[PDB]
């Protein structure tokens, strides 16, 4: 008869144990009650499995051959058209998008392998809309374009912007419109160490290490400004990046 097969995206194929007459594998699997069948060159899981919703909607399910990758796609009646489309990867990193009425990319939701998530909504025809970042206590709102998303905090007269370039560079900066020189606060990224360092009246203050587990972390300079002191404190709410900014 058949094995199951685990897949990305909480999902599980049935395969045939043996070929058919052309060397084929029957497919089935069930996600959401929904059944999907399709057949496969390969014996491994690997193929291309298709349905129709109660409302007349296509779906596709595609595995990639090696098991690594699933796409779950829903069409229009005609198949056309996308209405859906959700994407686990093999770094089990999830993308969910929505489609328009006429199919173009209007809503995307990427989940990280942590669980963090990027909203992306309003999606325009120039790539351009409305993001927002989900982290671990907290999130971050700003603005989405073809070059970056742009994430903004405010706290006083300061901008904390947190740049994520099209190919997910992190580049951080920050403007104070105070024009006092005793209080103003600048600041300078170090891209190599994905830190921000502020500096106010020409002595660093803190640290802000954005780091590759999508946290941000603070640690303060001692009176002088020229060395570090204590060690870092993970932030877990908005409240207390905002008392960094302070």
Not at 15 to 39: F, M, P, Q, R
Not at 113 to 126: F, M, N, P, Q, V
Not at 169 to 194: F, H, I, Q, R
């Amino acid at each position: 008869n058949s094995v199951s097969v685990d897949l990305p995206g909480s999902m599980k194929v049935l395969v045939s144990k043996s070929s058919n007459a052309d060397g084929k594998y029957d497919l089935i699997a069930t996600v959401d009650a929904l059944e999907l069948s399709g057949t496969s060159d390969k014996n491994n899981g690997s193929g291309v499995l298709e349905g129709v919703k109660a409302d007349a909607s296509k779906v596709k399910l595609t595995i990639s051959d090696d098991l690594g990758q699933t796409t779950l796609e829903v069409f229009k009646s005609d198949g056309s058209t996308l209405v859906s489309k959700k994407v686990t990867s093999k770094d089990k990193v999830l993308g969910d998008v929505k489609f328009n009425e006429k199919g173009e990319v209007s809503e995307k939701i990427i989940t990280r392998a942590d669980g963090t998530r990027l909203e992306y909504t309003g999606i325009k025809s120039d790539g351009s809309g409305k993001a927002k970042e989900v982290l671990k206590g907290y999130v971050l709102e700003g603005t989405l374009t073809a070059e970056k998303t742009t994430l903004v905090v405010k706290e006083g007269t300061v901008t904390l912007s947190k740049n994520i370039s099209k190919s997910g560079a992190v580049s951080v900066e920050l403007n104070d419109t105070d024009s006092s020189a005793a209080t103003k606060k600048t600041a300078a990224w170090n891209s190599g160490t994905s830190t921000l360092t502020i500096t106010v009246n020409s002595k660093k203050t803190k640290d802000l290490v954005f780091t590759s587990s999508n946290t941000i972390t603070v640690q303060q300079y001692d009176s002088n400004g020229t060395s570090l002191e204590g060690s870092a404190v993970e932030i877990t709410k908005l409240d207390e990046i905002k008392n960094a900014l302070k």
